A paper describes a structure:
We, thus, designed compound 2, which contained a 7-diethylamino (7-Et2N) coumarin unit. The coumarin-substituted electron-donating groups at position 7 showed strong fluorescence and thus we expected the designed probe 2 to be sufficiently fluorescent to be useful for PPARγ binding assays. We attempted to crystallize human PPARγ-LBD complexed with 2 or 6 to identify the binding mode of PPARγ-LBD. Crystals were grown in the presence of each ligand but 6 provided only the apo structure of PPARγ. The complex with 2 provided the co-crystal structure; the crystallographic analysis data are summarized in Table S1. The overall crystal structure of the 2/PPARγ-LBD complex was similar to that of the rosiglitazone/PPARγ-LBD complex. The TZD moiety formed hydrogen bonds with His323, Tyr473, Ser289, and Gln286, which was identical to that of rosiglitazone in PPARγ-LBD. Compounds 1 and 2 had activities comparable to rosiglitazone, showing that the incorporation of coumarin did not reduce ligand agonistic activity, regardless of if it was 7-MeO coumarin or 7-Et2N coumarin. The fluorescence maxima shifted to shorter wavelength and the fluorescence intensity increased upon increasing the concentration of PPARγ-LBD. We calculated Kd using the fluorescence intensity at 410 nm (2: Kd = 1558 ± 93.61 nM), (6: Kd = 4082 ± 712.2 nM). The determined Ki values therefore showed an identical relationship with the reported EC50 values, suggesting that 2 and 6, PPARγ ligands that incorporate 7-Et2N coumarin, were useful probes for competitive binding assays of PPARγ ligands.
Numbering used by the authors:
A (entry chain B): 207 to 239, 243 to 269, 275 to 461, 467 to 474
B (entry chain A): 207 to 239, 241 to 263, 275 to 474
The structure:
């Protein structure tokens, strides 16, 4: 029944709103234009912005490093939101406890870069709950190998953002990403796929009603899972390279 | 209109059959095992020597070269099939080249799954069957050349697509708007949109009791890219350890 699928759509939207304080709607208002965010385009802007915004990741040590570490701090925050949001997906909490951990472990990066797109345009990214805008050109300009940390995520955001998904679409797509049966170490795939099948049915009905003239948007969206897993792959490949530049309770909080 | 999409599905299924001599339906009849189509089985170096006589240098290299000559033949069939896709041949010629360059290996591993089960692979048009084990036991670096394709084929094959479903799926793969260097993305995407609509109607009619097959099949495209990626890594190893080992110019140009 449609009524069922719409019920599931609204349920996930309502929970997405409660879990994620900076929404796409909010992020779009801010990026296009009353209270312009503080812009970091250069080093002397950044050094002013630390003294203007009360950044939560700063401690008592070169700039590129401190910016990268700040991205880690936010990702750990975003893991807790996505965790909480996942518990609202019907059937999720009833899975085997290890598979809940396994799906979250392998799902959070995909969802991070998806939701990052909501805060991005060709020109930069909203930081610190949209209090800041860091320009793509000052990110691009950092020392090797941090210089093009974000460049992949920008290219992926620009192409994602062409689909014009809104928050009520992303709520369901994020749910589909968490419930992937192809994650390694899953003990009981069947119920995971049963819930993902229902999430895809809802995602299909939501795209058809919310975007009635965007042909095959469902298919184009699923195609973007490919660009997600590729961004993620080559992100770990930039990490494993950090462990050959980056020359202890902190280390633990992040891993 | 479903009538236009059914027409396009039949068009594509008819070209597929004209273009690929060894279909999935034929490959399955050989594997499940009729008197008239029993293949010769290579499971060790003894049986390899014997088979090299009944079917028609070190073994690892001879096999790898064989897979290469077989990709080169497959590129020719995929090229012929591509020309049959309404609109392909009307695109900018540079984009035709770029769509074949990136699509061909994703199609080769899709269609190689048709010839595979969890024990081995059909070779020489189904006259031979070479066991997963035998291919695993090859000296490094060729030992693990075939495993990732086997792993992908096991999982692809559980969708139980027949040739009519595959003919549309490989059309979707060729008409991919996101290939690097594409001059004119939008005309490819309008072809792909229509192919996607055709695949979606095909899967619901041919597999009515297989929930969200369409979305399961489109996620497989991530598994294909990974096969291609691992393989290029494996080739750059081979080119250093095996300096006496020829590479077919046509695949060298595809790998550039
Ligand atoms: C005397 C040669 N001989 C006996 C020893 C054989 C041996 C085997 C095969 C064979 N096999 C085993 C299937 C393996 O399938 C593959 C594997 C990989 C590719 C991709 C290629 S490899 C590369 O570097 N670049 C590519 O694009 C394509 C197909 C089929 C066949 O038709 O003939 C055969 C002959």
């Amino acid at each position: 029944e449609s009524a069922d699928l719409r019920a599931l759509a609204k349920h996930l939207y309502d929970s997405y709103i409660k879990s994620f304080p900076l929404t796409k709607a909010k992020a779009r208002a801010i990026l296009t234009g009353d209270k312009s965010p503080f812009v970091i385009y250069d080093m002397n802007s950044l050094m002013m912005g630390e003294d203007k915004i009360k950044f939560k990741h700063i401690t008592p040590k070169e700039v590129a490093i401190r910016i990268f570490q700040g991205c880690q701090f936010r990702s750990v925050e975003a893991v807790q939101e996505i965790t909480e949001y996942a518990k609202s997906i019907p059937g999720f909490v009833n899975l085997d406890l290890n598979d809940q951990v396994t799906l979250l472990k392998y799902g959070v990066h995909e969802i991070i870069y998806t939701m990052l797109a909501s805060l991005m345009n060709k020109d930069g990214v909203l930081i610190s709950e949209g209090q800041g805008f860091m320009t793509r050109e000052f990110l691009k300009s950092l020392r090797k190998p941090f210089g093009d940390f974000m460049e992949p995520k920008f290219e992926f955001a620009v192409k994602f953002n062409a689909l014009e998904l809104d928050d009520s679409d992303l709520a369901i797509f994020i749910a589909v990403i968490i419930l992937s049966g192809d994650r390694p170490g899953l003990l009981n795939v069947k119920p995971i796929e049963d819930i993902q099948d229902n999430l895809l049915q809802a995602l299909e009905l939501q795209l058809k009603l919310n975007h009635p003239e965007s042909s095959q948007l469902f298919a184009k969206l699923l195609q973007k899972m490919t660009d997600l897993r590729q961004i993620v792959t080559e992100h770990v490949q930039l990490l494993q390279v950090i462990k050959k530049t980056e020359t202890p309770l902190l280390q633990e909080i992040y891993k």
